[PDB]
Amino acid sequence: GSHSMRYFFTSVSRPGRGEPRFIAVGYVDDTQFVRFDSDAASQRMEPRAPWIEQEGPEYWDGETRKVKAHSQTHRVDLGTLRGYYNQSEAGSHTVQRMYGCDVGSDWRFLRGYHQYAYDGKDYIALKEDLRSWTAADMAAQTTKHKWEAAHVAEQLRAYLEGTCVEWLRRYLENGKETLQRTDAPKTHMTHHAVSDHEATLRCWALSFYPAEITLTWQRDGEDQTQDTELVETRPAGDGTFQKWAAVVVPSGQEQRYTCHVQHEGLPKPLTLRWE
């Protein structure tokens, strides 16, 4: 279907205990493919997906250099932000940044992103027009003015609409066997008696890829939200995902309920019923 590439950067200050901890990761859809950890010994951008390992030495030297540069600008940012918010030089603060692009099933640029957060809340973000900025608060206005004077939007737009989507397409093709193929969810339902009056039906979806999936319960063919529970989709640890949805039902009424599973890896939605 549609695809995306994203880079996630987290920098955490550690006053009096050395340099800020900087962690960078790159994803294509739900698959991580690179990372950099300021505290690791390698000091290099490292591969985390097989398909990116076929990139040559210039790719790695370049990404290593660029990621270290992102590391340094964030080191400066923490100081700048501590200032904008008149905060103590002693506390630990967190700056986060994310940028990347989305392409549609036709592989054409669909949307781009470039945004920052400080201490858990939005700070500034590039709007969908890839032209203007949204400063989350008063302090961010300074950055907004600064970025407008330095034409940061123009530079980002060229990268998001060009370079970003071009490399995403290259990744999608080199890694087609794992990024463009699907792994259908293996499903089953379990029954747990809660009491003599109620029972819990739990619908399972395991070992699927991509992560996107829809689990819904119906009673006599009508969607059911009440008395249901849906856990967050979670990583199995091998590249696939898991998720379950549960509904508490009156004893003896189990047969009225059906679990519906929608996923790109299925020729058609699946329907499960107890027994």
Binding site: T73, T143, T163
Partner: peptide, 9 residues
């Protein structure tokens, strides 16, 4: 591939 230019808040 990463963006190649420095950006400072």
């Amino acid at each position: 591939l990463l963006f190649g230019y420095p950006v400072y808040v």
